[PDB]
Design an enzyme around this catalytic site. Sequence first.
Site, short mmCIF file in Angstrom:
data_model
loop_
_atom_site.label_atom_id
_atom_site.label_comp_id
_atom_site.label_asym_id
_atom_site.label_seq_id
_atom_site.Cartn_x
_atom_site.Cartn_y
_atom_site.Cartn_z
N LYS D 155 0.83 -1.20 0.00
CA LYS D 155 0.00 0.00 0.00
C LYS D 155 0.87 1.25 0.00
O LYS D 155 0.75 2.10 -0.89
CB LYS D 155 -0.94 -0.01 1.20
CG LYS D 155 -1.95 -1.14 1.18
CD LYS D 155 -3.14 -0.86 2.09
CE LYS D 155 -2.74 -0.93 3.55
NZ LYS D 155 -2.33 -2.30 3.96
N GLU D 181 0.54 4.96 11.28
CA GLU D 181 1.48 4.15 10.53
C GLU D 181 2.84 4.20 11.22
O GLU D 181 3.00 4.80 12.29
CB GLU D 181 1.57 4.63 9.08
CG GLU D 181 2.14 6.04 8.93
CD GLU D 181 2.46 6.39 7.50
OE1 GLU D 181 2.35 5.50 6.63
OE2 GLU D 181 2.81 7.56 7.23
N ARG D 182 3.83 3.56 10.61
CA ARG D 182 5.14 3.45 11.23
C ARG D 182 5.99 4.71 11.06
O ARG D 182 5.93 5.43 10.05
CB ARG D 182 5.90 2.24 10.70
CG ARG D 182 5.13 0.92 10.79
CD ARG D 182 5.46 -0.02 9.65
NE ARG D 182 4.82 -1.32 9.83
CZ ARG D 182 3.52 -1.55 9.74
NH1 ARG D 182 2.68 -0.55 9.47
NH2 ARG D 182 3.04 -2.77 9.93
N1 LIG Z 1 6.49 -3.90 -6.59
C1 LIG Z 1 6.94 -4.42 -5.32
N2 LIG Z 1 8.21 -4.77 -5.43
C2 LIG Z 1 8.86 -5.28 -4.38
N3 LIG Z 1 8.22 -5.45 -3.20
C3 LIG Z 1 6.93 -5.09 -3.08
C4 LIG Z 1 6.28 -4.59 -4.11
N4 LIG Z 1 5.01 -4.32 -3.73
C5 LIG Z 1 4.89 -4.67 -2.45
N5 LIG Z 1 6.06 -5.15 -2.03
C6 LIG Z 1 5.73 -5.42 -0.79
O1 LIG Z 1 5.04 -4.26 -0.12
C7 LIG Z 1 5.31 -4.45 1.14
C8 LIG Z 1 5.23 -3.16 1.88
O2 LIG Z 1 3.95 -2.99 2.38
P1 LIG Z 1 3.55 -1.49 2.95
O3 LIG Z 1 2.79 -0.79 1.86
O4 LIG Z 1 4.81 -0.85 3.47
O5 LIG Z 1 2.54 -1.73 4.21
P2 LIG Z 1 1.10 -2.49 4.07
O6 LIG Z 1 1.29 -3.97 4.33
O7 LIG Z 1 0.13 -1.93 5.09
O8 LIG Z 1 0.55 -2.28 2.68
C9 LIG Z 1 6.87 -5.06 1.16
O9 LIG Z 1 7.03 -6.00 2.28
C10 LIG Z 1 7.05 -5.65 0.08
O10 LIG Z 1 7.26 -7.13 0.34
#
Ligand SMILES: Nc1ncnc2c1ncn2[C@@H]1O[C@H](COP(=O)(O)OP(=O)(O)O)[C@@H](O)[C@H]1O
Lengths: 151, 180, 40, 479, 507
Positions: D155, D181-182
């Site tokens: 997200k 959030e963090r």
């Molecule tokens: N295009 C992408 N390329 C690499 N990693 C991704 C990608 N999209 C998501 N990730 C994943 O998104 C996660 C990050 O989630 P984040 O948006 O920070 O919080 P939430 O879980 O609430 O959505 C990473 O752990 C990663 O594994």
Amino acid sequence: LVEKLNGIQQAEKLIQGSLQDVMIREIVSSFKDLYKSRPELHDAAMQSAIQGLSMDPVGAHFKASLQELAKVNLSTATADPMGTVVQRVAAVFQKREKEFLDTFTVKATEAQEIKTIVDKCHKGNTFDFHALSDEELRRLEQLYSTVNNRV
Amino acid sequence: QTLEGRYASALFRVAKKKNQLEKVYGDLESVRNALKDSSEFRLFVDSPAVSVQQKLDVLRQLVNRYKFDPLTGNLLTTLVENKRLPMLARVADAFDAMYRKEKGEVKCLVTSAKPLSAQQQKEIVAALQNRAGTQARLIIDYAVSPQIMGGLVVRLGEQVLDFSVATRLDRLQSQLLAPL
Amino acid sequence: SVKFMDQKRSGEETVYFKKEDEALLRNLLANHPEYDPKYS
Amino acid sequence: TNHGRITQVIGAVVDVHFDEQLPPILNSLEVQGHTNRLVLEVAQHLGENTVRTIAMDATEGLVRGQKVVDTGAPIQVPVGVETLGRIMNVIGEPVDECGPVPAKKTYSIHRAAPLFADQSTEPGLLQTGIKVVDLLAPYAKGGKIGLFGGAGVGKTVLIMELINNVANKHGGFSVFAGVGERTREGNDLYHEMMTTGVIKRKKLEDGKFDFTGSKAALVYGQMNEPPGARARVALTALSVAEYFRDEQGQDVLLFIDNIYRFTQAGSEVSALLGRIPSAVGYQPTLATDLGQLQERITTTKKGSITSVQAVYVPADDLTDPAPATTFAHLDATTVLSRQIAELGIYPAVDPLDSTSRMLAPEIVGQEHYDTARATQKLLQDYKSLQDIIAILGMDELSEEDKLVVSRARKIQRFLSQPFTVAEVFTGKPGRFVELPETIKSAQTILRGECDDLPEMAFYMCGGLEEVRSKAVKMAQEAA
Amino acid sequence: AKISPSEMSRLLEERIAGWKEVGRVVSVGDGIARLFGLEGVQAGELVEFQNGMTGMALNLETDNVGVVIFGDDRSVLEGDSVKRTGRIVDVPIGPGLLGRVVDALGNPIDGKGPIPAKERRRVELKAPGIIPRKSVHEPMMTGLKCVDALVPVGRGQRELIIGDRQTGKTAVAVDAIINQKEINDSTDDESKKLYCIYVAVGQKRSTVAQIVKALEQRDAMKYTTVVAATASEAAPLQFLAPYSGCAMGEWFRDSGRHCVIIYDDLSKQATAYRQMSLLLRRPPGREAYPGDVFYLHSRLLERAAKMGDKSGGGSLTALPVIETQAGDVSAYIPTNVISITDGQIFLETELFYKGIRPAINVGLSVSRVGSAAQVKAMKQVAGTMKLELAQYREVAAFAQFGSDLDASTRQLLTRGTALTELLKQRQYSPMKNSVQVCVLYCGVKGYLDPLDPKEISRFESLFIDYINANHQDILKTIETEKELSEKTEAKLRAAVDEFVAMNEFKK
Ligand SMILES: Nc1ncnc2c1ncn2[C@@H]1O[C@H](COP(=O)(O)OP(=O)(O)O)[C@@H](O)[C@H]1O
Ligand SMILES: Nc1ncnc2c1ncn2[C@@H]1O[C@H](COP(=O)(O)OP(=O)(O)OP(=O)(O)O)[C@@H](O)[C@H]1O
């Protein structure tokens, strides 16, 4: 050497800790005796409270015993339940100091034993060699490994 | 704060303003004594078989047949209208405390055994110059843990002056066991 | 049953289309030499 | 100024007594005699000149009878171009350690929404550079957008990519709101915006700073903050944006992270405020507390606010009341999935749960509408064979169904693309795919002019040229 | 220092000179007291009764005050006097805690000496903000293989260890603790040593004693401390223990040093909070918990952080632990803690009994930090490893039905089985990073594909002994450079070839 100095510092600290601990315990016991014994302290404490509502014998006796203790030279004293707090505390002092020096120093009996029975019986002017001896040379070696490993 | 606290504050206020203090004080004292002596007025107050009209009628007949102010009658009519008549005792106690606190405190105090008239005089005069409150009606007691030295509590809660032997002794000991 | 069916399906599809992609990679450059960098 | 006295203290709730002139509800009170600044917001009137309030900061250290001062207005946040480049708290205080806000104005965070007579504008199309988004769920320029998903689906990563591909090009302003959030994430966003010019901090020899430029504003009510702060920080940022909308007539962007925390931080205090609980554990005043926000979030005839809200979905349950009530409030919707993210198909968008008010033939032409619907039909057809494949096998399927499965798998793998902010996970460089390119490639794949190609070509690609190049390469290493 | 008679006695004599609020208990029950009085109490402060027992004031109601007691309520008698000290609840901090076992309030229970610490710290504190922080760039060597390769952990992270009962949660944490004694013995740089804190909530004293014994048997107590709030210990002590651990760790975090803290049975904290609020008549939420559970865990986990070069450069890593029931992670507490952490390490009983120990599911398990918390030498191998294991996990389910597959897929199955048999480990048998790198090199470059799966458990040990004996220099080079140059690549390949020559296995 560093570990030796850490150990001796800790020993000194625990010595002084136990010393003040017993000095307080015994001053307190002495006052608990003297109060219940003497009639005068009761009315003295009464007057003390009365004048405080606008020194007490407890603080007075404490300060007196402390002043009488501060200049005692506890080395010169007597046995454990000898009455006077100085005679009650110097026993602990001397005994703890002996149990200290016996653990961070060599004992004169251990010295005397070998000095008079082992070493000089070998030879004089230089104390040359050691084949002229019994198996107890091994014990002398053990004594070495005690002495240098306590000092 | 509480319900009885509310009615007691209202009564103490109005009786200080308009009618008088002593009148309503004596009226509440008389009612409390009749409650704790009759042993049927209490049941008349607590029972729900009594109708509101019989309650008010008996209360007005007590008003007329006894030395009684209008403020206390209005208090009783209010307590009946709001179903708070059992709180008469509590209200009376609340009214009692304030007046004697306004005038002069009662204090507790402890010794070992019977002291003498001399040091009793000394104690009372010392506590009087300490209070600077011209009225003091005290208590004597005997608890021997504080060995003989006169301990007490001048009753206002935030002053418990612990002039005692064993307490100062133990506090001193626990102080002088400090490190170095 | 759910993860069972899903993983079995995924593995079967992966294998089948791996084979098909191998075949298409074999037969691509012949039928589409305009991409073949051999002629560039 | 009135004066009141704290009467009791329960967690984040404070009951206060005044002798005269009670304050209205939602007014702000300042505690006097405390270590740091402590603000209370009135929430109820209990009677007997008593009120009940919610604290913005922790109540640790509070005493009964402690004194309180009414301000005569709710929590007023500063506003202007002076908040730009700067970080601010829920109460307007800065927490960037760069100085105080020299704002010439303040707004109350509690305002009334624009009425029905203040209409919206045309459904402007928003180009993100993302394929599945630009194709199946086009984003509106002046409308709300939703990113629904659980934990570990991308997200805030998607929001960062959207910020890179929209906010920098945007001539209007932008706002970010972090709601529970963090803090690592907040630090990372601040550093990346300072890097990429979205923030322009310039320190001076006299110890001051200069945030000139810096077409972005940031607001934070993060996890460490209590409820009341997590609740009101969204109102704070929304007032900061309403300033730019109403007066300056600007176009504004508004990113929000974990709006669900708002609802959570309501439910954390409702039972202390004496309300009976509703269903599974949220509060009764969920839909109204959310609607008063969302209706303030709308385009008017003075400006426009395009908003993008990330919605945590606990346990991947979209039947939860907070998402259920939030779906009705959005113009565009985008639902991320774990069953898809497990396949390495990033972005992990479900095109059968993503929707948009914009996807209509009159707004986007029939070349786009029919293409999108054909893609969705293909994917639903592929989904309606999963059990047949799991039970019997591919041997039973006809060649029509095998063609369908091949094309659907290729579309699935093709909608993936690599982002610029995912270099530190993938290492691959980022892509920006325009919408006509996406439509051309999808039309080609659906028409069948690429069945000769393999499937591993359509992975982390932004077009057909790269697909043909990868197929050439794979054939070379094949021989 | 100083001498007793002439100095200390004079000092105490000069010290003794001196002369010139309270409340009363009203209701008592179930480890909780309700007092009348003490109108000048800070909400959250310490309170002292007339029998030595202590308490903490939480509910400052109008009429009464709600205190929670640190012990049994047999001492309180509905009328006892009560006095406030004015201190907010706080605990000592320092290196005097290292090697010691203490309760929730810093009172030791080892039975050997008091706590030599002069500086105290408040229990509940404000976490550090956005500016005094930095990104995570240093790794936290866990000692395991699947963790250090596929779910890496940095210094400043907050990674959850979630699973069922009796799956290897404490064992994971104990191996993380045990791997650090080499790293700490081979330096005197406090900026590089990693100290440790183990908070045990709800555990039994037998288990805590077993853990202390396992650590003393390996000399793994001179850099750890333990905080035991067991089941007999009251609810407020169980509620305070993790905050006390964070307070003890903030000394390291702020003083330029590093630290790791393991909260064990983090659900007992929420149990205790439920208990307290329900005996304080506070109204519940869902699953009978209050609504402040998010603000119960956020306060705690936001204290983990990586500070900047101006605030010292310290770090506080967090490794919370959670026990689920029937694998239900759709619950409230697991959901909250997953939603407020930078990763996940799932643990399963199906994998624990199939033979995979540690039973880490590397699909669900993630780490948002990822490669940034990983050495380059480990990046090179672990990327390929993760890819291969993804493929194997995809294909093996269909493969197990007895179908006949090509060699390109048989190779996937073989390599996946090899890696799955490599990532198994014994309890209390952690390994260095260089040795993990070497072993996973042997596993990834294909020196285990033809070998039998059951033989890898001894292949691993024999190769470890071989490279520890005759090729320590390669390990030192990997430890220093933290990469694999072509020279080290060739040397490692040659060593593996020599090893396979010198040795013989079933294939
Ligand atoms: N295009 C992408 N390329 C690499 N990693 C991704 C990608 N999209 C998501 N990730 C994943 O998104 C996660 C990050 O989630 P984040 O948006 O920070 O919080 P939430 O879980 O609430 O959505 C990473 O752990 C990663 O594994
Ligand atoms: N690598 C391992 N090798 C062999 N046995 C293991 C391994 N890991 C765990 N075990 C076993 O898992 C069991 C539980 O150990 P542990 O102390 O980790 O419990 P836990 O996972 O914390 O769960 P709980 O505390 O609820 O009992 C033990 O029987 C342990 O021997």
